Design an enzyme around this catalytic site. Structure first.
Site, PDB file in Angstrom:
ATOM      1  N   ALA A   1       0.859  -1.155   0.000  1.00 47.15           N
ATOM      2  CA  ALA A   1       0.000   0.000   0.000  1.00 47.15           C
ATOM      3  C   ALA A   1       0.908   1.222   0.000  1.00 47.15           C
ATOM      4  O   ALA A   1       1.890   1.283   0.696  1.00 47.15           O
ATOM      5  CB  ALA A   1      -0.961   0.086   1.215  1.00 47.15           C
TER       6      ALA A   1
ATOM      7  N   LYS B   1      -4.009   2.946  -2.033  1.00 46.84           N
ATOM      8  CA  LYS B   1      -3.335   3.790  -1.067  1.00 46.84           C
ATOM      9  C   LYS B   1      -4.207   3.862   0.190  1.00 46.84           C
ATOM     10  O   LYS B   1      -5.393   3.949   0.047  1.00 46.84           O
ATOM     11  CB  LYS B   1      -3.161   5.153  -1.686  1.00 46.84           C
ATOM     12  CG  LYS B   1      -2.767   6.283  -0.749  1.00 46.84           C
ATOM     13  CD  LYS B   1      -1.310   6.153  -0.341  1.00 46.84           C
ATOM     14  CE  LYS B   1      -1.014   7.044   0.844  1.00 46.84           C
ATOM     15  NZ  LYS B   1       0.334   6.839   1.517  1.00 46.84           N
TER      16      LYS B   1
ATOM     17  N   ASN C   1      10.574   7.861   3.660  1.00 51.47           N
ATOM     18  CA  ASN C   1       9.368   8.596   3.305  1.00 51.47           C
ATOM     19  C   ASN C   1       8.625   9.192   4.488  1.00 51.47           C
ATOM     20  O   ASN C   1       8.446   8.578   5.527  1.00 51.47           O
ATOM     21  CB  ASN C   1       8.392   7.733   2.446  1.00 51.47           C
ATOM     22  CG  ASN C   1       7.391   7.047   3.242  1.00 51.47           C
ATOM     23  OD1 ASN C   1       6.382   7.634   3.690  1.00 51.47           O
ATOM     24  ND2 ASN C   1       7.651   5.804   3.522  1.00 51.47           N
ATOM     25  N   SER C   2       8.146  10.404   4.301  1.00 54.80           N
ATOM     26  CA  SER C   2       7.173  10.965   5.233  1.00 54.80           C
ATOM     27  C   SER C   2       6.117  11.616   4.343  1.00 54.80           C
ATOM     28  O   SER C   2       5.981  12.862   4.298  1.00 54.80           O
ATOM     29  CB  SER C   2       7.830  11.988   6.164  1.00 54.80           C
ATOM     30  OG  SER C   2       6.792  12.681   6.890  1.00 54.80           O
TER      31      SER C   2
ATOM     32  N   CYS D   1      -0.601   5.669  12.285  1.00 53.47           N
ATOM     33  CA  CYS D   1      -1.286   6.997  12.127  1.00 53.47           C
ATOM     34  C   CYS D   1      -0.323   8.224  12.242  1.00 53.47           C
ATOM     35  O   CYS D   1       0.822   8.058  12.686  1.00 53.47           O
ATOM     36  CB  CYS D   1      -2.464   7.122  13.121  1.00 53.47           C
ATOM     37  SG  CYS D   1      -2.375   5.978  14.509  1.00 53.47           S
TER      38      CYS D   1
ATOM     39  N   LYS E   1      -2.543  -4.092   8.798  1.00 50.09           N
ATOM     40  CA  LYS E   1      -1.157  -3.776   8.434  1.00 50.09           C
ATOM     41  C   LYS E   1      -0.469  -3.315   9.711  1.00 50.09           C
ATOM     42  O   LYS E   1      -0.912  -2.379  10.348  1.00 50.09           O
ATOM     43  CB  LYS E   1      -1.137  -2.734   7.322  1.00 50.09           C
ATOM     44  CG  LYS E   1       0.244  -2.212   6.889  1.00 50.09           C
ATOM     45  CD  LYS E   1       0.905  -3.146   5.975  1.00 50.09           C
ATOM     46  CE  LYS E   1       2.218  -2.617   5.476  1.00 50.09           C
ATOM     47  NZ  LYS E   1       1.977  -1.609   4.418  1.00 50.09           N
TER      48      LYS E   1
ATOM     49  N   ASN F   1       4.941  -2.609   7.980  1.00 52.78           N
ATOM     50  CA  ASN F   1       4.942  -1.205   7.528  1.00 52.78           C
ATOM     51  C   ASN F   1       6.409  -0.721   7.643  1.00 52.78           C
ATOM     52  O   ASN F   1       7.242  -1.484   8.139  1.00 52.78           O
ATOM     53  CB  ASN F   1       3.903  -0.374   8.327  1.00 52.78           C
ATOM     54  CG  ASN F   1       3.374   0.796   7.534  1.00 52.78           C
ATOM     55  OD1 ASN F   1       4.133   1.488   6.815  1.00 52.78           O
ATOM     56  ND2 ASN F   1       2.078   1.050   7.661  1.00 52.78           N
ATOM     57  N   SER F   2       6.738   0.485   7.189  1.00 51.18           N
ATOM     58  CA  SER F   2       8.129   0.995   7.234  1.00 51.18           C
ATOM     59  C   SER F   2       8.662   1.027   8.653  1.00 51.18           C
ATOM     60  O   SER F   2       7.896   1.057   9.697  1.00 51.18           O
ATOM     61  CB  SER F   2       8.226   2.348   6.521  1.00 51.18           C
ATOM     62  OG  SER F   2       7.296   3.209   7.024  1.00 51.18           O
TER      63      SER F   2
ATOM     64  N   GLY G   1       7.237  -2.663  -2.187  1.00 50.88           N
ATOM     65  CA  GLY G   1       7.081  -1.238  -1.972  1.00 50.88           C
ATOM     66  C   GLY G   1       8.255  -0.593  -2.679  1.00 50.88           C
ATOM     67  O   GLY G   1       8.175  -0.323  -3.887  1.00 50.88           O
ATOM     68  N   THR G   2       9.356  -0.402  -1.981  1.00 50.94           N
ATOM     69  CA  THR G   2      10.481   0.399  -2.491  1.00 50.94           C
ATOM     70  C   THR G   2      10.924  -0.113  -3.895  1.00 50.94           C
ATOM     71  O   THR G   2      11.129   0.688  -4.792  1.00 50.94           O
ATOM     72  CB  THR G   2      11.667   0.401  -1.452  1.00 50.94           C
ATOM     73  OG1 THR G   2      11.203   1.053  -0.263  1.00 50.94           O
ATOM     74  CG2 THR G   2      12.870   1.198  -1.916  1.00 50.94           C
TER      75      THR G   2
HETATM   76  C1  LIG Z   1       6.083   6.306  -0.785  1.00 53.33           C
HETATM   77  C2  LIG Z   1       5.512   5.283   0.175  1.00 53.33           C
HETATM   78  C3  LIG Z   1       4.146   5.360   0.572  1.00 53.33           C
HETATM   79  C4  LIG Z   1       3.584   4.390   1.440  1.00 53.33           C
HETATM   80  N1  LIG Z   1       2.306   4.455   1.864  1.00 53.33           N
HETATM   81  C5  LIG Z   1       1.745   3.537   2.646  1.00 53.33           C
HETATM   82  C6  LIG Z   1       0.301   3.618   2.933  1.00 53.33           C
HETATM   83  O1  LIG Z   1      -0.419   4.518   2.427  1.00 53.33           O
HETATM   84  N2  LIG Z   1      -0.140   2.662   3.723  1.00 53.33           N
HETATM   85  C7  LIG Z   1       0.627   1.650   4.229  1.00 53.33           C
HETATM   86  O2  LIG Z   1       0.080   0.768   4.911  1.00 53.33           O
HETATM   87  N3  LIG Z   1       1.955   1.510   4.035  1.00 53.33           N
HETATM   88  C8  LIG Z   1       2.521   2.432   3.207  1.00 53.33           C
HETATM   89  N4  LIG Z   1       3.897   2.394   2.889  1.00 53.33           N
HETATM   90  C9  LIG Z   1       4.643   1.304   3.461  1.00 53.33           C
HETATM   91  C10 LIG Z   1       4.774   0.199   2.436  1.00 53.33           C
HETATM   92  O3  LIG Z   1       3.513  -0.337   2.187  1.00 53.33           O
HETATM   93  C11 LIG Z   1       5.711  -0.880   2.955  1.00 53.33           C
HETATM   94  O4  LIG Z   1       5.193  -1.356   4.207  1.00 53.33           O
HETATM   95  C12 LIG Z   1       7.087  -0.353   3.199  1.00 53.33           C
HETATM   96  O5  LIG Z   1       7.549   0.499   2.138  1.00 53.33           O
HETATM   97  C13 LIG Z   1       8.104  -1.482   3.419  1.00 53.33           C
HETATM   98  O6  LIG Z   1       8.179  -2.310   2.305  1.00 53.33           O
HETATM   99  P1  LIG Z   1       9.422  -2.180   1.228  1.00 53.33           P
HETATM  100  O7  LIG Z   1      10.616  -2.537   1.980  1.00 53.33           O
HETATM  101  O8  LIG Z   1       9.075  -3.047   0.122  1.00 53.33           O
HETATM  102  O9  LIG Z   1       9.426  -0.731   0.811  1.00 53.33           O
HETATM  103  C14 LIG Z   1       4.458   3.326   1.984  1.00 53.33           C
HETATM  104  C15 LIG Z   1       5.782   3.282   1.583  1.00 53.33           C
HETATM  105  C16 LIG Z   1       6.350   4.198   0.726  1.00 53.33           C
HETATM  106  C17 LIG Z   1       7.840   3.999   0.416  1.00 53.33           C
HETATM  107  O1  LIG Z   2       1.493   8.136   3.886  1.00 54.69           O
HETATM  108  C1  LIG Z   2       2.481   7.866   4.647  1.00 54.69           C
HETATM  109  O2  LIG Z   2       3.323   8.728   4.977  1.00 54.69           O
HETATM  110  C2  LIG Z   2       2.719   6.545   5.121  1.00 54.69           C
HETATM  111  N1  LIG Z   2       4.053   6.045   4.848  1.00 54.69           N
HETATM  112  C3  LIG Z   2       4.452   4.784   5.275  1.00 54.69           C
HETATM  113  O3  LIG Z   2       5.631   4.363   5.191  1.00 54.69           O
HETATM  114  N2  LIG Z   2       3.473   4.026   5.867  1.00 54.69           N
HETATM  115  C4  LIG Z   2       2.179   4.452   6.124  1.00 54.69           C
HETATM  116  O4  LIG Z   2       1.468   3.626   6.694  1.00 54.69           O
HETATM  117  C5  LIG Z   2       1.751   5.745   5.750  1.00 54.69           C
HETATM  118  C6  LIG Z   2       0.379   6.170   6.024  1.00 54.69           C
HETATM  119  C7  LIG Z   2       0.162   6.294   7.571  1.00 54.69           C
HETATM  120  C8  LIG Z   2       0.950   7.348   8.122  1.00 54.69           C
HETATM  121  C9  LIG Z   2       2.095   7.087   8.882  1.00 54.69           C
HETATM  122  C10 LIG Z   2       2.910   8.123   9.415  1.00 54.69           C
HETATM  123  C11 LIG Z   2       2.557   9.479   9.174  1.00 54.69           C
HETATM  124  O5  LIG Z   2       3.332  10.502   9.707  1.00 54.69           O
HETATM  125  C12 LIG Z   2       3.905  11.486   8.796  1.00 54.69           C
HETATM  126  F1  LIG Z   2       4.938  11.845   9.337  1.00 54.69           F
HETATM  127  F2  LIG Z   2       4.266  10.886   7.518  1.00 54.69           F
HETATM  128  F3  LIG Z   2       3.087  12.739   8.639  1.00 54.69           F
HETATM  129  C13 LIG Z   2       1.397   9.751   8.416  1.00 54.69           C
HETATM  130  C14 LIG Z   2       0.639   8.698   7.906  1.00 54.69           C
END
Ligand SMILES: Cc1cc2nc3c(=O)[nH]c(=O)nc-3n(C[C@H](O)[C@H](O)[C@H](O)COP(=O)(O)O)c2cc1C
Ligand SMILES: O=C(O)c1[nH]c(=O)[nH]c(=O)c1CCc1ccc(OC(F)(F)F)cc1
Ligand SMILES: Cc1cc2nc3c(=O)[nH]c(=O)nc-3n(C[C@H](O)[C@H](O)[C@H](O)COP(=O)(O)O)c2cc1C
Ligand SMILES: O=C(O)c1[nH]c(=O)[nH]c(=O)c1CCc1ccc(OC(F)(F)F)cc1
Lengths: 313, 313
Positions: free
Chosen positions: B20, B44, B68-69, B131, B165, B195-196, B272-273
């Site tokens: 996602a 997303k 990422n943020s 969150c 997740k 998740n990250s 993801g990445t």
């Molecule tokens: C640009 C970006 C946006 C992401 N947005 C979400 C999100 O909306 N919801 C979520 O559950 N995880 C989100 N993630 C986390 C990824 O789904 C995944 O858990 C994370 O990148 C680790 O996997 P990877 O090592 O393959 O990147 C995001 C990651 C990236 C790099």
């Molecule tokens: O949209 C995101 O930033 C995001 N990135 C991820 O790696 N995982 C996620 O689950 C999400 C959506 C949920 C979320 C986590 C941390 C947040 O704090 C931030 F600093 F990015 F404002 C916001 C949304």
């Protein structure tokens, strides 16, 4: 152009030292680290009684870092206290002694006895909080009520400046609470960020097997895997603990990696995995590489860039 | 030989899907992921209202991974709902919809509305238990009483199978507690690990600056940095949640990495990445490499080795 630092009432030729647990368990190791070009050294985290630690294989390294479940093998406190009070050459470089007791009472008993040696020889205490308490509860630094208790009791019992070795946190709320607990203890003069990234799992694809024996292959991660995590924690505590020093530890392989720790706010910079892999010769390389980066940038001392990482807007 | 499989009352052509947040925010993205060789796709994570997210640069990638943020930029729940209900071609592959409301009540209102689309269309709910930071309280999956509340309320309001997740954990006692929460809830049929890795910090040596703008450069890590963490979480939940499926996510750039996730216990494997960097062609390569590893080991099915990672003694 110089790498020298004066802190905690001691002089350091450069910021580099081993990370606790690497090349520091035996007399031989400590003599080796003292013969190296490191700016300081820290002893293996010790318990009251000597320990054999966990079964082998219990450490493995790969291109991007290392996994370990050593289980605190060590020669016991009496050996490290004797190295500090009778064998170490303080004219070479300063010594940190790491303690990792398995209960608050164990830690108290060890610091009461270190105190006179610290006052007399200038050995510096690093209390390892990234460490087992009651099993089925989290390690001590992940239980803030336990952490407060350990710092309350060790402060009382030791009475002298010391430092803490901290695990990595991954939540802003945790950075906030942890620094606020540490900020209650004015004797905590330095914070070492970070211990290993806990309970990772390395699997070998050919053999379909975990690579270490203890804990079903789960163990702490070090090396390239953890440099951004370690930089975040250095900087999060540098920012929240203005009256304290931060030592950086995690993912240092090069002078460039050290430079980034220092930008993040590091005073001392510790080397674990890379030192385990390359050996003590690494310290000359890291010194040369860091000075080469300073030269190119026109920096003459470490204070000119320590903690000066730029943010965007 | 083919990597076909059945989970959650749906058929999948192979166990790969996007993570996602990656390639899944707009209709264009979702169409691109639908046209790819992936076995499924996830939208997303969405909030009730549309969000622009945080200021740019907010994502950066490097040889070892990404930071990422983003700030939950999304088109809002009405868009992803509409996509699920009217636009997605379910004959091509299953769809998962990720929800990340900013409060429990926000989530309950989204799931109430999603339920009849799930019944009618077969879209699967992934509830994102991470969150945005609210000073004083940890992210929801790091506050187990909050987590139990979210799950009670969502289970009550949604009434149908769903998944969650999870952020990574780093301490065995947390794995025990988290899995015990999740096992209170029979409607939680899958757990996505991970998740990250939260709040790491990347610094560029040349410019002496952080690389993303929000949160003073602090952001979640993905990619090679996080593979052993992701494998450890997958396995820990696989072991603790025998009546649930575990979806693996973290550090997948090859068929080999996928193979290790499935050994650890993964039923689907999210990218993801590596997908952000390489684009949707990555899915044909991952397929080819995983089958090649299978062929050389003599595995004909994923079931033959899923969760069969070997321990030492
Ligand atoms: C640009 C970006 C946006 C992401 N947005 C979400 C999100 O909306 N919801 C979520 O559950 N995880 C989100 N993630 C986390 C990824 O789904 C995944 O858990 C994370 O990148 C680790 O996997 P990877 O090592 O393959 O990147 C995001 C990651 C990236 C790099
Ligand atoms: O949209 C995101 O930033 C995001 N990135 C991820 O790696 N995982 C996620 O689950 C999400 C959506 C949920 C979320 C986590 C941390 C947040 O704090 C931030 F600093 F990015 F404002 C916001 C949304
Ligand atoms: C084999 C090994 C033993 C370790 N033992 C200890 C220890 O006894 N006390 C401690 O504070 N940290 C210990 N550590 C943690 C390291 O001090 C360091 O925090 C961690 O490995 C991260 O640094 P790196 O990325 O340079 O390895 C050990 C690490 C390794 C690999
Ligand atoms: O001796 C170690 O295992 C060790 N390794 C580290 O990376 N950091 C440390 O702080 C220590 C000593 C503290 C400690 C950590 C984890 C433990 O559980 C284990 F399973 F490894 F035994 C025990 C002690």
């Amino acid at each position: 152009m110089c790498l020298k630092l004066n802190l905690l009432d001691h002089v350091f030729a450069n910021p580099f030292m081993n990370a606790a647990g690497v090349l520091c368990s035996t007399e031989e190791d400590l003599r080796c680290m003292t013969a190296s070009s490191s700016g300081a050294l820290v002893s293996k985290s010790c318990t009251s009684a000597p320990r054999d630690g966990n079964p082998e294989p219990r450490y493995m390294a790969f291109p991007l870092g290392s996994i370990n479940s050593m289980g605190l093998p060590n020669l016991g406190f009496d050996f490290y206290l004797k190295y500090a009070s009778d064998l170490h050459d303080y004219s070479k470089k300063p010594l940190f002694l790491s303690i990792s007791g398995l209960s608050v009472e164990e830690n108290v008993a060890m610091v009461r006895r270190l105190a006179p040696v610290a006052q007399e020889k200038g050995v510096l205490l690093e209390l390892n909080l990234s460490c087992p308490n009651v099993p089925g509860k989290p390690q001590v630094a992940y239980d803030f009520e336990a952490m407060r208790t350990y710092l309350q009791q060790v402060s009382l019992a030791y009475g002298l400046p010391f430092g803490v070795k901290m695990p990595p946190y991954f939540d802003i709320a945790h950075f906030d609470t942890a620094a606020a607990v540490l900020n209650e203890f004015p004797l905590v003069k330095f914070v070492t960020c970070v211990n290993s990234v806990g309970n990772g799992l390395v699997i070998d694809a050919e053999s379909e097997s975990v690579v270490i024996k203890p804990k079903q292959g789960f163990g702490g991660l070090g090396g390239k895997y953890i440099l951004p995590t370690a930089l975040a924690n250095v900087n999060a505590f540098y920012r929240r603990c203005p009256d304290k020093l931060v030592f950086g530890c995690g993912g240092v392989y090069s002078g460039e990696d050290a430079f980034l720790h220092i930008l993040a706010g590091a005073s001392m910079v510790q080397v674990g995995t890379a030192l385990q892999e390359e050996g003590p010769g690494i310290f000359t390389r890291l010194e040369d590489e860091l000075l080469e980066i300073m030269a190119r940038k026109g920096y003459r001392t470490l204070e000119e860039f320590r903690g000066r990482v730029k943010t965007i807007e």
